[PDB]
């Protein structure tokens, strides 16, 4: 399941 | 036995300190010994909140 579409991480944003 | 009932009373202060209860060390031993008699603790929650209320009207 690392080949298919996974949700975005939210780490890219400054939470 | 008084060594045991001191430790059990000393641990019980911390759980009343992080729960942010205004009970200091003296009022705790009063309330612990009074609860040890057999009084229902649902009522003691009201006398302390009222004694602290009438105390504030003085100041």
């Amino acid at each position: 399941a690392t080949l298919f579409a996974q949700a975005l991480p939210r780490d890219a944003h400054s939470t | 036995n008084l060594n045991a009932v001191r430790e059990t009373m000393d641990v019980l202060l911390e759980i009343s300190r992080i729960l942010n209860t205004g009970l200091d060390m003296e009022t705790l031993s009063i309330c612990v010994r009074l609860c040890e008699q057999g009084i229902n603790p649902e009522a003691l929650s009201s006398v302390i909140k009222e004694l602290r209320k009438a105390t504030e009207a003085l100041k």
Partner: protein, 158 residues
């Protein structure tokens, strides 16, 4: 000495300085309020419901401590049932914290930016405390320095 344990309780909550008749009247407020409830669920569960609300707003290890003591307090139940009632009534460092630079075998983590973001709020609250003091120190004394002659002075009130 149940008739006396209510008399010693009424002394502690009495703030030190008529101190001889107030105790007689405050013992009424103790009795006038004790019999209102008497006229009109496990124990450890009520702590966990307060343990939850701890972890949500941060401060995890403190919540892991509150449960650490009630586990040793087992080896009295009605006493902790009294503390959970007054939970909100009270009045309002360690370098070996996160510090990925010290340890014996520290695991690989990569940048966090979620510990350094809660390490600048530890400082921002400091500069915001020592600034409210200077707002609550120049105000408490300028409210008296500039007023009508003889308001804040107690000797002129005689």
């Amino acid at each position: 000495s149940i008739t006396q344990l209510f008399d010693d309780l009424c002394e502690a909550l009495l703030p030190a300085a008529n101190r001889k008749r107030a105790k007689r009247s405050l013992k009424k407020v103790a009795y006038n309020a004790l019999f209102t409830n008497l006229f009109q669920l496990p124990a450890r569960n009520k702590i966990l419901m307060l343990s939850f609300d701890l972890r949500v707003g941060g401060l995890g290890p403190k919540a892991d401590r509150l449960e650490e003591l009630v586990e040793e307090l087992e080896a009295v139940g009605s006493v902790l049932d009294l503390l959970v009632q007054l939970a909100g009534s009270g009045p309002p460092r360690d370098y070996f914290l996160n510090n990925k630079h010290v340890g014996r075998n520290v695991p690989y983590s990569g940048y966090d930016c979620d510990d350094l973001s809660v390490f600048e709020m530890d400082v921002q609250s400091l500069i915001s405390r020592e600034e409210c003091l200077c707002h609550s120190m120049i105000q408490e004394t300028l409210q008296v320095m500039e007023a009508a002659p003889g308001t804040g002075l107690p000797t002129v009130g005689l």
